[PDB]
Amino acid sequence: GRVHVPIAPRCNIHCKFLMTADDAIKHVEKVKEEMPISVIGVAGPGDALANEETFEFFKKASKKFPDLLKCMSTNGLLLPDRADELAELGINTVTVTVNAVDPEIGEKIYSFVVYKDKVYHGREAFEVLSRNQLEGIEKLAERGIIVKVNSVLIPGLNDEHIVDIAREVKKRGASLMNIIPLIPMGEMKDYPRPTCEQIERVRNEVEKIIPVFR
């Protein structure tokens, strides 16, 4: 019962691990006529916040679809600058991908970040992303938007660090954490998919700090 529309091509970060807005509206209305829908979301293919089409779409969906839950996923880089607008457009839930809170780990996950038309590399890239996404969680949460945090479990990189993430995002106002196992491909093809003993171990530990999606 959830429709995601692909209207957000541009991404503003490089992590190592199409419709117009009006065409997406017509798609939702056609899908609603054939299937019960309760949620509309924007999640990709890039970052939702890095694309003006995202906000044009939710503006129109506000009028045409007041009853539906509205959600989006983002890396959070633009959340401090867009959090107010998201609230005004009726976004109910935002999923923020947070893969580290310690820069010695985060610098190994992100290669660069593009923010206000400056390219940051390496450790500075993660520090900019991390500050913005964590502040963004609190700006969303204080406006009533449900914040869900996605964290990719990278064995040998952040596996023992996920509970630190959970403590930090809980302090900022997150409601739920979703631990996602790494699927190695291309960049970081040399990392393994986590064992299922490990994924359920970390889920059980995180659950003591914040609710976990299951």
From TrEMBL:
Pathway: Cofactor biosynthesis; Fe-Mo cofactor biosynthesis. [4Fe-4S] cluster 1 binds at residue 71. It comes from Methanothermobacter thermautotrophicus (strain ATCC 29096 / DSM 1053 / JCM 10044 / NBRC 100330 / Delta H) (Methanobacterium thermoautotrophicum). Belongs to the radical SAM superfamily. NifB family. This is FeMo cofactor biosynthesis protein NifB. Its cofactor is [4Fe-4S] cluster. GO terms for molecular function: 4 iron, 4 sulfur cluster binding; lyase activity; metal ion binding. Keywords: 4Fe-4S, Iron, Iron-sulfur, Lyase, Metal-binding, Nitrogen fixation, S-adenosyl-L-methionine. Residues 1-214 form the Radical SAM core domain. It comes from the Archaea. Involved in the biosynthesis of the iron-molybdenum cofactor (FeMo-co or M-cluster) found in the dinitrogenase enzyme of the nitrogenase complex in nitrogen-fixing microorganisms. NifB catalyzes the crucial step of radical SAM-dependent carbide insertion that occurs concomitant with the insertion of a 9th sulfur and the rearrangement/coupling of two [4Fe-4S] clusters into a [8Fe-9S-C] cluster, the precursor to the M-cluster. [4Fe-4S] cluster 2 binds at residues 11, 15. The chain holds residues 28 to 258 of 288 of the full protein.
